[PDB]
Amino acid sequence: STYDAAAGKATYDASCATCHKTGMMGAPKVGDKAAWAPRIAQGMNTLVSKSIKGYKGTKGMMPAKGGNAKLTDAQVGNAVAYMVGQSK
């Protein structure tokens, strides 16, 4: 159901920050407002779907579930909620 960005921080820290804290190899850096603005406009459904499925965009490779197949979709989406909430 509804996103839990606070619970999402645990997943973000363990599984996502490794690329997104500094923005390595094209990953949009958490807190980078210009990088995130058009991504946020896609809405959460699309952000979370692309995060669970993986994709390659103009910046680099976003691996499915951050590369950790042991994550649930709920955990991944909660981590996205955390990232978006910190990037406005």
Q: Which residues pair with 61 in a beta bridge?
A: 56
Contact 48, 80 (CB under 8 A): yes
CA distances from 42 to 7, 9, 16 (A): 23, 21, 20
Backbone angles phi, psi at 62, to 5 degrees: -100, 100
At its nearest, how many Å lie between Na ion and the CB of residue 68?
Answer: 25
Provide the minimum distance between the beta carbon of 47 and Na ion in the complex, in angstroms, as a whole number: 10
Minimum Å gap between C-beta 45 and Na ion is 4
How far is residue 53's CA from residue 11's CA, in Å, rounded to a whole number?
17
Does position 43 interact with Na ion (CB under 5 A)? The reply is yes
Site for Na ion in 49-78 (CB under 5 A): none
Binding site residues, Na ion, CB under 5 A: 43, 45
Extract the annotated binding site: 16, 19-20, 62
Binding site residues, ligand HEB, CB under 6 A: 11, 15-16, 18-20, 25-28, 39, 42, 47, 50-51, 57-63, 65-67, 71, 76, 79-80, 83
